[PDB]
Amino acid sequence: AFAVDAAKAYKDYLASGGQPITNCVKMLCTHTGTGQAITVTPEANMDQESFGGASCCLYCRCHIDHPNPKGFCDLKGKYVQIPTTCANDPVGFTLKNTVCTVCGMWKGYGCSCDQ
Amino acid sequence: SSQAWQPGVAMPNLYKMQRMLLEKCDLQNYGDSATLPKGIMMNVAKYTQLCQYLNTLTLAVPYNMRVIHFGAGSDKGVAPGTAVLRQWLPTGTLLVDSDLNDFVSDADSTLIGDCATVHTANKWDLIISDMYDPKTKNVTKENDSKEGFFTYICGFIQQKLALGGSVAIKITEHSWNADLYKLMGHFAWWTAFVTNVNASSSEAFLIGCNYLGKPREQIDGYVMHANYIFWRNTNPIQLSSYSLFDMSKFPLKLRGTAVMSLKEGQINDMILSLLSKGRLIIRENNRVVISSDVLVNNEN
Numbered sequence: 442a443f444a445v446d447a448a449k450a451y452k453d454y455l456a457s458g459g460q461p462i463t464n465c466v467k468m469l470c471t472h473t474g475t476g477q478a479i480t481v482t483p484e485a486n487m488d489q490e491s492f493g494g495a496s497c498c499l500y501c502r503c504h505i506d507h508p509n510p511k512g513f514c515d516l517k518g519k520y521v522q523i524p525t526t527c528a529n530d531p532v533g534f535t536l537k538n539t540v541c542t543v544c545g546m547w548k549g550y551g552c553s554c555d556q
Numbered sequence: 557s558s559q560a561w562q563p564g565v566a567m568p569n570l571y572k573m574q575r576m577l578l579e580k581c582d583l584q585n586y587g588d589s590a591t592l593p594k595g596i597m598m599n600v601a602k603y604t605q606l607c608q609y610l611n612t613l614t615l616a617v618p619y620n621m622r623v624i625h626f627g628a629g630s631d632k633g634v635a636p637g638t639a640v641l642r643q644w645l646p647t648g649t650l651l652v653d654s655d656l657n658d659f660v661s662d663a664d665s666t667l668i669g670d671c672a673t674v675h676t677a678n679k680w681d682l683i684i685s686d687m688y689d690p691k692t693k694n695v696t697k698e699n700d701s702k703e704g705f706f707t708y709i710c711g712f713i714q715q716k717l718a719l720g721g722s723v724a725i726k727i728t729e730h731s732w733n734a735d736l737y738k739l740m741g742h743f744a745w746w747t748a749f750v751t752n753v754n755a756s757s758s759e760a761f762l763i764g765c766n767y768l769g770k771p772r773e774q775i776d777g778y779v780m781h782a783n784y785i786f787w788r789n790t791n792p793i794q795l796s797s798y799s800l801f802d803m804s805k806f807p808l809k810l811r812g813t814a815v816m817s818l819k820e821g822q823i824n825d826m827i828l829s830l831l832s833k834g835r836l837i838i839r840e841n842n843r844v845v846i847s848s849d850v851l852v853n854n855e856n
């Protein structure tokens with residue numbers, strides 16, 4: 442009944458003032474994309490930065506098993522769009538937020554389905 | 557001049573035709589660094605400019621394209637160049653990368669080990685290598701052709717690059733191999749390309765465009781490296797990041813180039829012509845299957 446809770450450890454580390462994980466791979470792009478959260482190619486809009494997905498995944502970067510029961514990664518091999526205001530901590534952003542399954546935008550950072 | 561707006565500079569043809577002796581590389585702007593866009597890694601900028609230049613060549617871009625990327629790890633434990641390659645290549649392109657040391661990657665599959673351990677059942681449409689050992693750079697010793705991973709790369713191209721495919725292999729003043737230059741004469745066209753963001757380095761990418769599987773031209777690789785250094789020594793390149801701000805036409809166009817499985821007896825001049833124009837890839841279209849040899853040791 443024991444498994445390491447990496448997400449809680451990183452969140453707690455952040456809340457106590459630890460420096461965000463760095464060397465997330467930021468892509469060059471036009472910043473005229475759809476703004477969707479996780480895409481097959483960089484899709485940042487003017488308010489976002491696009492990053493290589495694997496470098497923004499806590500589980501990839503920490504060399505640990507993904508919580509997906511089959512060990513699949515939501516980010517590796519794709520590009521993740523991070524609001525520019527949060528681009529200092531892309532790993533923390535992807536960990537703490539969820540993608541709208543309807544529109545593909547980040548809940549609270551693009552998804553307007555609740556309008 | 558207007559070169560500052562290009563992604564980089566390719567070796568002018570007249571330099572390729574010289575018969576120079578090898579000298580030390582002495583760059584006017586040695587030690588200068590380009591100012592990169594905020595938060596952008598050198599190797600993202602470098603691979604972006606490489607891909608921007610590759611867009612100007614007659615690359616074969618088939619459906620079911622397969623690309624292999626050697627030396628893809630970084631001292632950061634991530635793979636910036638792989639991320640750029642995957643951005644550039646058409647969606648669905650099979651991308652394999654590899655490096656000596658463990659790293660986290662966006663490639664479809666990653667092999668960790670010496671490149672000499674890497675084997676593939678299939679042939680490849682594009683081979684990219686950023687392999688480099690800084691211990692080759694020794695300005696106090698003679699600068700001879702290097703073997704090591706260059707020996708592997710030469711054999712790998714000849715055995716596993718599809719006809720019509722292309723390569724980009726990183727070299728420097730001291731990290732180079734004469735047979736690899738000789739092998740550039742087995743492509744329809746070739747060059748040495750210097751990225752504008754890294755213009756103050758003797759680095760270049762040695763690009764072979766459209767593999768013909770036989771010599772189109774006999775190149776002496778010792779002389780050709782001397783020609784490359786002579787070019788670098790007499791042509792300062794202004795550091796520039798300008799092309800990074802223009803990504804509107806970055807993605808490689810899915811040309812849908814034909815793939816055919818042909819036997820050696822069937823490759824006539826008309827086929828060679830098609831290969832030379834980026835209009836044909838010759839290989840099987842089977843499954844992509846890779847492996848890495850593992851040396852087993854019991855130290856008990």
Ligand SMILES: C[S@@+](CC[C@H](N)C(=O)[O-])C[C@H]1O[C@@H](n2cnc3c(N)ncnc32)[C@H](O)[C@@H]1O
Pocket residue numbers: 599626627628629630631635636637638654655656657669670671672686687688689704705
């Ligand atoms: C300039 S770095 C790679 C930078 C990387 N392309 C990037 O996108 O940041 C040189 C790479 O070549 C690798 N390399 C050098 N010799 C190698 C060998 N014999 N086999 C496999 N990889 C090698 C190094 O481990 C090292 O990671």
Ligand SMILES: Cn1c(=O)c2[nH]cnc2n(C)c1=O
Pocket residue numbers: 581582583584586695729756757758
């Ligand atoms: C390219 N290059 C140079 O241009 C240079 N100039 C002085 N040292 C130098 N070194 C070590 C070098 O590698």
Ligand code: NA
Pocket residue numbers: 615616617681682720721722
């Ligand atoms: Na190709």
Ligand code: NA
Pocket residue numbers: 690692693728729730731
């Ligand atoms: Na070197």
Ligand SMILES: [Zn+2]
Pocket residue numbers: 495498499500501502507514515516517
């Ligand atoms: Zn992951």
Ligand SMILES: [Zn+2]
Pocket residue numbers: 541542543544545546552553554555
């Ligand atoms: Zn929504």
